[PDB]
Design a protein around this nucleic acid. Sequence first.
RNA 1: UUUUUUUUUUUUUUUUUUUUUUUUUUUUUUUUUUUUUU
RNA 2: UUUUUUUUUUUUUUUUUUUUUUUUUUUUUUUUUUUUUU
Lengths: 436, 470, 436, 470
Amino acid sequence: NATEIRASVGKMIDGIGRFYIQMCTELKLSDYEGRLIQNSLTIERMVLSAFDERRNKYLEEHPSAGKDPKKTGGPIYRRVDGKWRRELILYDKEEIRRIWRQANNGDDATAGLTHMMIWHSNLNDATYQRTRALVRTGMDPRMCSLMQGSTLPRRSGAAGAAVKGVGTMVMELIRMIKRGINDRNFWRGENGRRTRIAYERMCNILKGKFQTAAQRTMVDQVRESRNPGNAEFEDLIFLARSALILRGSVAHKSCLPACVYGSAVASGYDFEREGYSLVGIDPFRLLQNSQVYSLIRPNENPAHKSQLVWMACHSAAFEDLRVSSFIRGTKVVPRGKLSTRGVQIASNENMETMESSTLELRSRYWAIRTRSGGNTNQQRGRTSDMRTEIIRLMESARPEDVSFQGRGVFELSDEKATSPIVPSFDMSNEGSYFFG
Amino acid sequence: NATEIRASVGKMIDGIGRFYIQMCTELKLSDYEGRLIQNSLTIERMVLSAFDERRNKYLEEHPSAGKDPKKTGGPIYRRVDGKWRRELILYDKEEIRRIWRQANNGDDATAGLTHMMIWHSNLNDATYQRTRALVRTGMDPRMCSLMQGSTLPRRSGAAGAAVKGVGTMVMELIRMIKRGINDRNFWRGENGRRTRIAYERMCNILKGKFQTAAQRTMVDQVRESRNPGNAEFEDLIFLARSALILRGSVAHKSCLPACVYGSAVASGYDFEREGYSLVGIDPFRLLQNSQVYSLIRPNENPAHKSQLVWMACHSAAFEDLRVSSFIRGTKVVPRGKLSTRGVQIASNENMETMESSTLELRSRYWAIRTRSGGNTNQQRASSGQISIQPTFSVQRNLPFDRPTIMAAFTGNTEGRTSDMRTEIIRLMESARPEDVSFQGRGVFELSDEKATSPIVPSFDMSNEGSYFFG
Amino acid sequence: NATEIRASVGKMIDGIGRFYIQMCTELKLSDYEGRLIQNSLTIERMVLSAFDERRNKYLEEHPSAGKDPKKTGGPIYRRVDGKWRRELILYDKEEIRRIWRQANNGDDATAGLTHMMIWHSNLNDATYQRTRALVRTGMDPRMCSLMQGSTLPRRSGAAGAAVKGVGTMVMELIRMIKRGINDRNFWRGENGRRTRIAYERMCNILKGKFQTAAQRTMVDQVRESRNPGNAEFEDLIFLARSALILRGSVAHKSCLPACVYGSAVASGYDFEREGYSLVGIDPFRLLQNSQVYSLIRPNENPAHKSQLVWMACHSAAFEDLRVSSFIRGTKVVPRGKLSTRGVQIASNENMETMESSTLELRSRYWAIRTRSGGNTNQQRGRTSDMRTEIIRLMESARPEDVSFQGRGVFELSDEKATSPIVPSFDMSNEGSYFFG
Amino acid sequence: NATEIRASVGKMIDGIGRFYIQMCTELKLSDYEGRLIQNSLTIERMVLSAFDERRNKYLEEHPSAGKDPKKTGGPIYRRVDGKWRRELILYDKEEIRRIWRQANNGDDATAGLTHMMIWHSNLNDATYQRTRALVRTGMDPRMCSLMQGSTLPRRSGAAGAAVKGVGTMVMELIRMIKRGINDRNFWRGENGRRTRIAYERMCNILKGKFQTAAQRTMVDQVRESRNPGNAEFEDLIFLARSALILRGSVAHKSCLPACVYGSAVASGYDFEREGYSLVGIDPFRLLQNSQVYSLIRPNENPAHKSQLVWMACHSAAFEDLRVSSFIRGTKVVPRGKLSTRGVQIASNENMETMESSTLELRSRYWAIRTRSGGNTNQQRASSGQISIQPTFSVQRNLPFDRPTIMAAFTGNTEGRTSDMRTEIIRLMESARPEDVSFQGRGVFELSDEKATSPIVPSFDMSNEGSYFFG
RNA sequence: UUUUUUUUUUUUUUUUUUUUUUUUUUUUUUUUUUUUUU
RNA sequence: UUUUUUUUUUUUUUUUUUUUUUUUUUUUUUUUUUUUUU
């Protein structure tokens, strides 16, 4: 049944929106200031810093960074008669812990935590990707497309584990392998047993993510090495460059700004009654009547900022630019010529230059975002023997194979997925590559 | 965090200034004599000769040079009613060792040693550069600009290693290569292992100093030769003449005279409390209210001597003359027509001719001195995506950059790896004497403390000459 | 040249005897009490506890065992008019450190330390052998004969390393192997490097100890294992049971009681002038005119005690009983029917029962004790292939092969090794086995 | 060191005695009523029912037996002017949990729990032994002597595991084997893994309990069966009837009534200062000046009740009657003609017949109770040298014990390993009912404190009967 | 002519055992009573 | 119909580099002086 899942997610987002309402009440912010992305961003890093129970335990025994008992950051942006000012207001974790506890009807609301931390991962992937660490592990910078969910820490659950990319898992496992190579860390002690356990958990997440049998079997055989040394490093690099084309079935969770939920809940649109979905039309229509204000530099233009915000909201920064333009109805500029910077504001930037303006989120069309792979795969002793089939499959692969047969782009006016329209692009080589 | 580094350097310079105070107390010198550069210079060669533990061990087993048990030199200059007299006062190392130990609160203070020895290297580079050794190794005398930190011996640490120039490392490595060519010194013994170790330490210092990937890779491949013979000699000469334009990111440590620190500490300006920095405004403002006296020949003029002292203090002898003039506000005379000599006084020079006078160190402006490079190396292989991920479920093609996909996988036998000089040549051809560097940074005024608003300089004064030598 | 070695050992033993003279002066003991083995034994454990610089450093950071700042034990035995009384007199290390420093003319005298600690190892091997640890490592108790120098710690030098038995090294290496198996201790850290270094030092000591090429080569190949696991355990057990017959050339250092040296030095017999030797006639003739008193239980007999003391002095507890009887001239009782106990006295034993009496050390003959092996050996991919030659050599070995051709037992009256007498035993099967 | 163990046990028993003091304060009982065994017995079943965390968790999900939220039993006996009355006062666990927590200075005091539960096991073994379960598993009723610590559940730690008898472990393992035979319970699930783990823990407890190598090896080989079926049942029955004579080294923990500790603590005899021991003179001298009152039926005699109480206190119900009589100084009546019943009072017995009187615990002598075995197992394979080392350089043969040298090397295929019962039988035949044990140890007098001089007992009183049952 | 290195708790009651040795939970049992009965 | 684990120091000045980064000793040199001479 799907009604129970819809009711659960509706209750969750209703609690999130009511927490947004209460923070707006408590912060004494104006109506416009309650529609600012920066305030929600800072509040949600406060959120993660309050539920990072592992880091809370680590920092209680580590009193450093000066004035850091329980309070971090808090750069609240406020309006005086047109101008803007930031105040470093410090909030302790514990009261916000109870305000959450009262916001979800006595529950912890860890799932909502997973969705907010994933949405932060989505915005991070949209804005900046780290070839720095990618080459720190020595892997080439050609695979920036598989850094989805890279910023997500381990503390997230299965729902968080679903959206992390294959390359993110590759980086996380190579970190553990290099740590176990630097020092003899795999002893029979509890630490070795626990890192072992985390290793097979991440590995069966990996093998669940893939679709073709060959890569699943070679991941199975990579496990057979009780002592991860150097050979497994190139083995899993080969796995990664095979997943470049033999991509894993990774989900795309549609989370939206902290405000969008709050404005919807404030207006009285109860999500429990009519039901809510995370993959269907829902996050599209909530943005059809949503107003969002944002802060922009004197050199930054808002036109690219709105498109980057739509990237962050719908996690389409790793998709083809042509398709995103089709759903937008307007051309989406690649990152090569974006005359904009990161959404977050640096701690040293002055305030006389900063200017607030609206963001456009309306899209002409809507589409389903399933956790499936291209139809091209369906059309098609050690690790090297399977690398041979990897090579022959890569040779069989073509840049022409059309995927996603039987599905299409839909119009906004339809609610039950009745009749789609088939898109068709013949616009030469505009560039289906967000980076480069 | 940067507060801890500031506190550490403040404590270090406070200890240095207090040691200067105690030497002034012990030497029974007057107020004017405590503001003489020569006294600090001699005292600091005493300093290095007392912490040169390697040379101490070498000389204990080598009792030569006549009366040299523990005492060397010591030409202290003193005033009698206007006139000057030098006394060869000999100080043993050990008591000064304990006076240091009490001056840094029970610590050895080796970092301060590194900064004083670097400052001696700075003054040496400002005064005299050795094409003698540069052609002893046979390298042409055109590269005198890369002799920064040449006088620095190996005993300095990482902080000392940061400021040594690329050419200094080239000279040091060619010395070892020629020694290993003269005799079969790379045997499996401990000496060969230790010289090997020092070799890779100097080489990863080198590759850390560079910025572009091509030179970093060719330095990596130079390492692959287990037996350094003759080919590596021209290989690293090519490396050096490539670094002529593809310069390495070498730091510029701002050390000041032995007295300047002592006068500041004596007045009660504690550096631990307000914090201290080695790159920012700090050494500039301490010289804004510093008085320095110096010794000058009857033919030498003090006007060029003050500018040469500013060179030595701020290690700007290898920079453009126009920029140094802009910060000075007055024209800086190149070494071609400097009617002056070395700061240090020869052991045979008479004293009736010698005359003491003030030095000018005030500068109209101040600027940050980062360990970065210009901007003319970024035209080669660009980055970008190679694959795509389906976000929306739309019936569309999945664009794959296939010809690079084979390139990553491939699976054949590479021909060879020896043509990086070719990219060196093409980068040199791409380089122009017009490319402006250091975008987004500017020269600042003295009255500002937090780097608020700079002023952009602009020189159109023909070809006055941006070359300190020649 | 051999004169320099003789002069060095003579100077060393002269310093030792002068230290014995000064301890007799300082302790205010009588003439008889200066000829007691127990006093010298306690004083020499004080000696080792004062030069155990490693243990000194370990105990300074570990203030335990109640009153233990610098002083340990010290059960000095004294006579009142026939009866005996023990006093627990505590001496600190440091003053005895300087008294040594003045006793060896400003030198540390570490070699003398090695000889005293070896002589303690000799007495320990003579009295009690530990099958407890031998089966703690799981090795069978059949090899008690290779426990020579077992009590010797690592701190001894090359001279100490020469006399340690093959089985002692086997036990020491198995201890390190089991420690490295229990935890991942072979990391790239300094501890792993240092235990590695100690490992090859002990191994080339081992391969120096052996004589035949096959065992030297298999010890060389045992080294090739960078990770000592379980296979090397049985490999080196096979090495040990091969050394059972293919015995290693282990020296036998002839050290004598703390008093014997002191009495000789007190009488004015300077050893520097006439020269001294550790293998030749020397320790034999010094015992020809030496008087020794010892403490005996009311049930213990002195007849077996004197023979056990001769065992401890000449380290002949692992030799054939028949030969030791021949040099003695009297039958030597094996340990099976020795109605005696350990030489050292337990801390709880009462004093009214204890009785002091002389010990006999005179021997009818004298013999050289070289660090060579039996002449029987001269008559004759992995570890198992060499185990094959081990088995065939063992089969070629016979319990009849006579060894030590060209050498014989000598008389006391001869000084320059002129003419020996060939012994010949036909006394059935009296038993050439000290244990069992 | 032994001082730390003595201090720990002294602190533990001091906490126990202080808890007894506080229960006496809270229950408003008189001085005489505080010296009753029944009150302490009921209070200590309350104790075990409060720390039976496993049963607490099982009963919270199982609300049965009527009024049983947190309270069980509680038959407190009280005096009115000579007569006796029982009140069913119900106490919840949780407040007593905190009163313990405050009684042991913030600690849980689980060790004390182990000693009280062992002392309940001791009294149960003294009073009634279950041939009912012994024949439920089908084992003959001849082995009632190995039911020591039978009532002890698994929750006890290593200290509790030490005192459980061999037969108790045999019963516990046969229960698990029969459960695994009834249903396929050894699957790869967590339950199978955990019962497996408990199985090897109980088995290495077993092999630690034994002394001779043969039984230790056959227990090792019993483990090799991954699927415990029927053969292992008779295998371990043979193990048990071998342990009948080849007894295991099982300890005898000397616990005393709940009151005895309380009276000693109340008088101010701190056990931490002077030290306490569980095996030495200690529990003997505390009973030398201890007063105990008990409840007796109108038909029961107190003379046998005092002796049975001494049995329960010192766990001597499985020992020879003659020895217990010697330490007592009076004849100890075997259970065949004991005109008494169980110490605990049935829930339906009336109160007009019940009469309270003193108990005698004074003993003429004292003895150590070590966890060692007799002496009749040392006739088999002896040890000794196999090789020799040449000490003197003499022309002589090197004696080698060749036939054992092949035996150590060998290199063939062993026939089988299932004939250890054969050595069991031959050892049993070698065993005699005459072999005297415990050489070098004797019975001591009360006046001695440091184990100075014993007296050797000697019994020639025919066949009075060294068998408590039958 | 062959040599003083230190890494988290051991040992002289004694001669071939013993360990300074430890709070885990899985579907219904038991105090009318002492060797049967379900 | 698929899920909150914690182990010794990191990060919001910024968008693809830079590192919070460090006292080793091997057979005769150098302050008459600034680019030669041995």
